[PDB]
């Protein structure tokens, strides 16, 4: 055997449902990521500003 690969783990209805579900979860999770990052950035900016004023 040259190669063995699993192709289309399904059913077909399942293709879409599964991908869709994961997609939504991913979007929300990543947005949460943005939130965390943004919070860190703001914290950082605050530190630097204080230093700068200093």
């Amino acid at each position: 055997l040259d190669d063995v690969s699993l192709t289309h783990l399904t059913f077909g209805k399942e293709f879409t449902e599964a991908v869709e579900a994961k997609q939504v979860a991913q979007q929300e999770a990543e947005r949460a990521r943005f939130v965390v990052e943004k919070a860190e950035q703001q914290k950082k900016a605050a530190i630097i500003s204080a230093e700068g004023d200093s």
Binding site: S49, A50, E51, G52, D53, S54
Partner: protein, 49 residues
Amino acid sequence: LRKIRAAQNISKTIATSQNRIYLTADNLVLNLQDESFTRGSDSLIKGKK
């Protein structure tokens, strides 16, 4: 100076207050009309010979 910076920001928020009321529209009145007549001021009686 971090204190100064913070003080500046806080002062900005506290001090600054403004109110604005704005309403505008383009008034472009275009009228096409004529002073026509639909009345009987007085009836003069005339005749042709």
